[PDB]
Write a protein that binds this ligand. Sequence first.
Ligand code: CYC
Lengths: 49, 161
Amino acid sequence: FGEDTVPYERYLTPGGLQMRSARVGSLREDIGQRVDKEVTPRFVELGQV
Amino acid sequence: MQDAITAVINSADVQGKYLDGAAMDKLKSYFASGELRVRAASVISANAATIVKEAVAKSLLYSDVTRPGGNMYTTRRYAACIRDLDYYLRYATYAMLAGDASILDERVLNGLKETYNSLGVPISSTVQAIQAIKEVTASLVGADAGKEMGVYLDYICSGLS
Ligand SMILES: *[C@H](C)[C@H]1/C(=C/c2[nH]c(/C=C3N=C(/C=C4\NC(=O)C(CC)=C4C)C(C)=C\3CCC(=O)O)c(CCC(=O)O)c2C)NC(=O)[C@@H]1C
């Protein structure tokens, strides 16, 4: 911060980051989980017009 | 030929897709209209001859068509015209009961104009007779059933014109 900048939160401890981004909300789908790429069934695609 | 249910089923099949919400809603609409259509068909079956008689009397009597020169002259031609009107009434009732006009399209309209032109019969007079049958049927059946029959009768007239 120069002579003209208000301070701001620049770094987070891992515990605080976990508290912020580990709740059921605000938890990304891909953080600690195997994300299986959902795809339509092959027979559905075959029979699709 | 196909009623409303069969038409919906065939359309969904041609798209190769199941019966979605729209198709289910249409089938439910037909089911709701089923009792109305059944009662209207029963009434028209009860009063079929009277309907054609009154429509002919109020639309196609004491005119040039009935007189010699008109295509309704002679017992043969008058009977042919009466049978044509009876066919129109019965097939319109069929279309009303089935909730679709495919039966009229494949059993009535196809070649109707061609035969009428070949035999020189008055298409305008036939249209007016269909009109009169429409008012008689509406009076006998009621308002909503009358409109349901009338839409198919007007479709017949439009095809024949
Ligand atoms: C009556 C409202 C009007 C009228 C009718 C009239 N039609 C014919 C002859 C024919 N009409 C048809 C039409 C159909 N026959 C069917 O089975 C169906 C399927 C739904 C239809 C639409 C046909 C095929 C004929 C010819 C065969 C027959 O024997 O009827 C006539 C007689 C014509 C003749 O030369 O014999 C008449 C009088 N005529 C009018 O003037 C009215 C306006």
